[PDB]
Amino acid sequence: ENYLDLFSHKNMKLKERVLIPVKQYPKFNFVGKILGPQGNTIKRLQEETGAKISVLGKGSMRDKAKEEELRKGGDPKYAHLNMDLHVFIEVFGPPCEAYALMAHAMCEVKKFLVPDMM
Amino acid sequence: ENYLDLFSHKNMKLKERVLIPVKQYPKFNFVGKILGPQGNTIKRLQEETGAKISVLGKGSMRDKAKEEELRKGGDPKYAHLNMDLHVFIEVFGPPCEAYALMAHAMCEVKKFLVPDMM
Ligand SMILES: [Cl-]
Ligand SMILES: [Cl-]
Ligand SMILES: [Cl-]
Ligand SMILES: [Cl-]
Ligand SMILES: [Cl-]
Ligand SMILES: [Cl-]
Ligand SMILES: [Li+]
Ligand SMILES: [Li+]
Numbered sequence: 001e002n003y004l005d006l007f008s009h010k011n012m013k014l015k016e017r018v019l020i021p022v023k024q025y026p027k028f029n030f031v032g033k034i035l036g037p038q039g040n041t042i043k044r045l046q047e048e049t050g051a052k053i054s055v056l057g058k059g060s061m062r063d064k065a066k067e068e069e070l071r072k073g074g075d076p077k078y079a080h081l082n083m084d085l086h087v088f089i090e091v092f093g094p095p096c097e098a099y100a101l102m103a104h105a106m107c108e109v110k111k112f113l114v115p116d117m118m
Numbered sequence: 119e120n121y122l123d124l125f126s127h128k129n130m131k132l133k134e135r136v137l138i139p140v141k142q143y144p145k146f147n148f149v150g151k152i153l154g155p156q157g158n159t160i161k162r163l164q165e166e167t168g169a170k171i172s173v174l175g176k177g178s179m180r181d182k183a184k185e186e187e188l189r190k191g192g193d194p195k196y197a198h199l200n201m202d203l204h205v206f207i208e209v210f211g212p213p214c215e216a217y218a219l220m221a222h223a224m225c226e227v228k229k230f231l232v233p234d235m236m
Contacts, residue, residue: 003204004136006231018122018213086121095136096225103217110214113124 004095011092014102018109020057020085025115031055031062034087034112050091051105057085087113122213129210132220136227138175138203143233149173149180152205152230168209169223175203205231 004012020030034055035042046053057080061067070078087109091101111117122130138148152173153160164171175198179185188196205227209219229235 002135003202004134005139006136006228007139007142016122016213017120018124021123021125024125084121095134096221096228099217099221099224103214103221106217107214110124 006095008094012095012098013090013092014098015088015090016102016106018087018089018106018113020055020087021113022059022085028115030112030115031060031085033115045105045108049105049108050101052088052090053105053109054088054090055085056080056088057083059085124213126212130213130216131208131210132216133206133208134220134224136205136207136224136231138173138205139231140177140203146233148230148233149178149203151233163223163226167223167226168219170206170208171223171227172206172208173203174198174206175201177203 022030033041034045036044042053042055058067060081067081071081089102089105089109091098091105093101140148151159152163154162160171160173176185178199185199189199207220207223207227209216209223211219
């Protein structure tokens, strides 16, 4: 019920929402650096880690105007635009794989979100 | 609230209860193989993975008599003896570390619990 069964036919899901730390680094352009030109960084990042990774929340499109318009329209696909800016990592698999994927993704995302580390 | 903050002063905890699959391998002595002589396997295993790892549930002491006695005494430390046989993995750390620890532990524990794999 709350146990993991290694022989289960269902994959497990792990999901996390990691705050982009704008408080600690007020002028650093996290959205630009994560997405990359054309979104190639985030594309590479998902390919290398095997996770779904998304930037969401106020500022995720950088374009205060387009964000305003899409919130205002009330469409639920855009409900996230009200949330604090954050990275949403989602993985699926049997336990061993799912944890390994999340671990990989989480550690790569840390590299972007603590940009002055080491 | 539900977000991970990478700058949080609190460590995160991950915990999992992985069923020992007695159904799939009815005669295999999982408890003996995980603990080892004197409990040195489980000791090594925690040292190598950095996780707390425990065998709990009916059969975890192999000694149907001692288990009977400790359940009967009603002490809550032994409430687990009523549960299905299982491995309880517990880790703590900031996100990246915590996931990496859980991933490592979970994958090592899989090796014991799917003993005919590869
Ligand atoms: Cl349970
Ligand atoms: Cl599924
Ligand atoms: Cl890793
Ligand atoms: Cl939330
Ligand atoms: Cl703590
Ligand atoms: Cl691993
Ligand atoms: Li910033
Ligand atoms: Li067994």
